[PDB]
Amino acid sequence: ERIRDLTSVQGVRENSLIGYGLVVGLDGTGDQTTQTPFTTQTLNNMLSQLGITVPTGTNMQLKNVAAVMVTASYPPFARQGQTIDVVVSSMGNAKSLRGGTLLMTPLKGVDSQVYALAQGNILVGGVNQLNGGRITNGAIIERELPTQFGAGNTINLQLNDEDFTMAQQITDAINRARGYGSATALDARTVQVRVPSGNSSQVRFLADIQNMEVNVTPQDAKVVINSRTGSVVMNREVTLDSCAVAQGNLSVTGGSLQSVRSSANLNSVVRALNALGATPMDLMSILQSMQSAGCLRAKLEII
Template sequence: MKTFGGNWYRQAAIVAACLLPLCGQPAFAERIKDLASIQGVRNNQLIGYGIVVGLDNTGDQTTQTPFTTQAMGNMLSQLGINLTTEQATKLQLKNVAAVMVTAVMPPFSKPGQPIDITVSSMGNAKSLRGGTLLMTQLKGGDGQVYAVAQGNVLVGGVGASSGGSKVAVNHLSAGRVPGGATIERDVPTAVGQGGFIYYELANTDFGTVQNMVEAINRAISPGTARAVDGRRIAVRAPDDIDARVAFLGRLENLDVKPAVGSALVVINPRTGSVVMNQKVTLDPCAVAHGSLSVVVDAGNRATGQPADIQVTQANGSLMNVKAGANLADVVRALNALGANPLDLLAILQAMKAAGALRAELEVI
């Protein structure tokens, strides 16, 4: 009897130890900072036109890219080297490439702060590997200069060509310069309006908005947050900037359980990708699908051989598709059809038209 009791207590302790971590963790909860952003706190896109030099004969063919020689002439004139129009048009600099320089200026950026830049060829340069970007002004949407970029371009690829043969690994006409730009002007960013700040969800969802309002009011005090619409939440915040920053730091780490969205199937016909969420269901239906292929042989005109055209349609038997009450059942039913991803695109669209697919179809 003692042995039985000892074993029972031991088994109960093991089960309790296994269930304890599950009881302590919130189910499918996400932080507010992962679900929403503060209105007005945003990135700013910057763009500029620049020149990359120091290439190993992989730059622009300047006879086909006149803007490269024009940019080189303008740059040399600023350095005190003046070329005539005839001299500028005869430049053949295969180690120079015209590029577009882009960057993202984070919110609250201050002068002197470095940011990463992306350099992309806009001419016919074969590779930017080993090149150096010369000083380039980066402008915002208002035409003002917000950063200045310069540095060695890092290209994550390699290539070689000889005798008409060519080999390339990864993309060679674009690269990055880590910390290659320096902020010269900041963008004023207001955190909130008056006594409120506004959170904006990444996706419109009334259920998630309500859950977020309840989480904030429960953690701070009732009435602190209220829903404005299906995407925006107004939160009463302290007026003092130090207290407001601390308040926001506390809010963004609160856990919120996002509401489950509507049933959705996303289709990409270019790649044959099909993605569906957990709310997709199926009603019983019957499906028959057969692929049609057309093969055209142009023949040989020199020998008088005529063209040959063959049309083949694979047999497709009518199959009964069972109802699926959850995602696992839907996947099991679709796999039973034995269709490849491209055929599955047409089958899903036909199911939707027949009313058997309980989900929205979105083509990207």
């Protein structure tokens, strides 16, 4: 059950759907409608569609209606009649969408075609975000996408992370499990697999391939630094080289220059860095300086 966790099947992908709607039933926490003319304009549009023509010159000050944007994911092999979850986000000067209801909303694709229709009740946590909510099974699929699955005798497994070693390992595992020339590698990210012609046979082949177990070879050493959240993460391949480190208000537990020993595994690296007595914000600067000097034998990525 590792191949399904390391790769994705070519043609089996997700799309993004967007749409505009109105959320009603709020407890006076909707749009002001004086700074958001589109709310009243679209409410008048809906009323006109339903058979009510409000005169153009009239002041409408609503409190229970909010103009919202609805986002959804079009799943692979989606069929009409199926339901998907949607996210509803306020667009202007609304206060809350706690007990609102989303009216009929057409969800358009990139090609500006309706692929789903959204309508349901919003669930809002209520420190919690008030202007955003989620509706489970809130949209019904209305259009279906053609696909080439089942045509041809080749399917590509696309690795989540590029690696020649992992691509070769997956290819060798498939060849060890299902014949000599069952899988070949095209690059560091794509493995081409030969499958029998048809739909059911390819589904069977993919079902056998997906749950296969592949031992993950060691990746590249990498230290991920998030300055916006104040976090540091080091994987198991990080090593250290011996060198001296000095930083403000940090001293030997003594002098301001502290030795850092040569470290081979991650436990040694953690011990050496904890001997410094550094706050993670200080550890960020220490790690960047050590990468500049050359002690840190890892790829420092700031995210």
